[PDB]
Symmetry: C2
């Protein structure tokens, strides 16, 4: 027989491009959620109750069940903490925190409160991702090459944050490839060597060359480059004995040998995942891609290339 | 009534100073262990069966129950992996791996095999550590200052490894203070800002200034310095309202207010801990201090100071 379900009452904290282009539109389509409030000193949503602080909102809106926290990782611990302390489920934007320690702390808090915490990784939900995963599982794998090369100027015009110590530099778009690889490969990998290319100012890298291995010694090469002004590349190529998969366009398209076998629904699947784990009563906090970033910074030979303006 | 127990049959893999000064002597005193074999291309132990490779030893000595792996983190994954694959308990030297990812991998392997894995942190077992921990628990804490300043020249004469990318630089002795703080404090902390001081060659830092917070905003300041040629400092000072604790000499001595309240038994307690968790059927892999190191490298403003010879 049919089981009726009331919506999960959702609040949004934060504003910006991703909030307008991705969050709000996906929420509007998702019937398992009701958007009941927003909290921000930088904007409101027409016809939705608004508050300037997360504490003000948690006080005044006791019907809230969950919160999507859309700010950058810098400001984000404190807000995630109060939400979980209130017992709300929490949807974290990518990467899930500034440090791994903050995140492991938030995770412990969440378990203790029975609240579902979620590290979203949008790229992991790009439309050819699961078909790559299922493929690689039936097949034997030889090598893996990750190419993620894009032009800063085009995507991050005049921005300061990316270059702060902590801003991650090229790892900012790079963690997305990591969030795919981590899901796609059969076995976990680890960094074996890394080179990090910094400008003379600022305190964050422009390119990286990284090698990984798994336990069976499968080699993984990753190149991240923020100077690729020409052809845009977001691919992960795997030499297989069945016999060569290419996943391109940030996980969007899959060509087995050359037989190129759906449309981009990343944020809508994130919200499906969030609805899903709330109803299962679980968390989904995979830190593996942020862990790879931190390892790269810890192991990386710090190489200086020029200046950037 | 009395319960009799046979020894845990132990193998040692690796050689060096710590093997002679700490491991072997502690093993010799510990009746819960029997040293049955060694594996190394760099030395043997008189009257103990010797092998050149860990695989040779695991084949020929089926009575082995556990292994202490004493090599540096570089070589150490592969050996830890084969041991756990064999189903042996594993005692890892500090830090437990080169990367956090390798360690999380070894941990998963261990659980899957039912084998006890152990990240040893010797300094955590320094003789005033538990008295600090119990103190801070009954008390309210204001601030925490960590001073860990030592002269390289004295302790690491002419060594190359410490400066490799991956060698950790000053974080090598610094992770020991981290391994205390992590145990001593009531709540977990996280890095809020960090400065990392590199020489012009090599690829690893000489000093670090690091700030942390916990959830209640308790401030923690840490200074690590490898140029302190004068007074040797390994202290962690906590301003309390009961009313000021000093833990000095790498966790060895405790002065509450000035009432300075045992002798150094780090490795013997490590082996007690290892015997203990094997009999309980559990692992003890606290990565929190290595996690702090990786965070520091990921968040750190990379500052250049001079050259080093």
């Amino acid at each position: 027989y049919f089981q009726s379900m009331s919506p999960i009452n959702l609040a949004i904290v934060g504003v910006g491009k991703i909030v307008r282009d991705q969050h709000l539109p996906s929420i509007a389509k998702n019937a398992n959620f009701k958007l009941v409030a927003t909290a921000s000193r930088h904007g409101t949503v027409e016809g939705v109750n608004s508050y300037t602080t997360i504490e003000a909102m948690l006080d005044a809106e006791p019907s809230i069940d969950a919160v999507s926290l859309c700010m950058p990782p810098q400001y984000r611990y404190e807000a995630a903490y109060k939400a979980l302390v209130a017992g709300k489920h929490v949807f974290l934007e990518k990467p899930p925190g500034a440090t791994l320690s903050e995140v492991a702390d938030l995770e412990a808090l969440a378990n203790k409160q029975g609240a579902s915490l979620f590290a979203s990784w949008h790229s992991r939900y790009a439309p050819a991702v699961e078909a790559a995963k299922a493929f690689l599982a039936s097949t034997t794998i030889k090598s893996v090459h990750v190419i993620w090369k894009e032009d800063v100027r085009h995507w991050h015009p005049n921005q300061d944050w990316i270059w702060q110590a902590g801003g991650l530099g090229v790892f900012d778009p790079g963690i997305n490839a990591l969030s795919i690889v981590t899901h796609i490969l059969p076995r976990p990998v680890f960094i074996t060597g890394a080179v990090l290319e910094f400008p003379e100012n600022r305190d964050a890298p422009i390119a990286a060359d990284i090698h990984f291995r798994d336990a069976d010694g499968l080699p993984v090469h990753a190149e991240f480059d923020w100077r690729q002004t020409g052809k845009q590349s977001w691919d992960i190529v795997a030499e297989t004995a069945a016999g060569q998969m290419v996943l391109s366009e940030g996980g969007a398209k899959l060509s087995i040998d050359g037989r190129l076998t759906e449309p981009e629904q990343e944020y809508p699947s994130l919200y499906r995942r969030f609805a899903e784990i709330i109803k299962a009563g679980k968390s989904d906090v995979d830190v593996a891609p942020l862990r790879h970033v931190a390892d790269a910074f810890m192991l990386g030979k710090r190489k200086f290339v020029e200046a950037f303006h």
